Amino acid sequence: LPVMVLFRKDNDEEAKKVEYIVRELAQEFDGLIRVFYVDINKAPEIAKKYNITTTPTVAFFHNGELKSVFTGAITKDQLRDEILKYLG
Secondary structure, three states: OOEEEEEEOOOOHHHHHHHHHHHHHHHHOEOOEEEEEEEOOOOHHHHHHOOOOOOOEEEEEEOOEEEEEEOOOOOHHHHHHHHHHHHO
């Protein structure tokens, strides 16, 4: 399954909308993708590995490889279109 990972900071107002969007897509594509939520402060080594410095950031992985990274202003349509790409 393709994987979508939300990198988040705890007290972040814009991160709230992206977290809603990601959870919405997680349900919409349940069973077809896996979604993980990484707290930058609780897991700094993962954020460091993936060069995550701003939050919210959403990354996509497939076949154990990093495929794309979205930062800054993030929309549901952007994320959904990536999900569809890796589903075929």
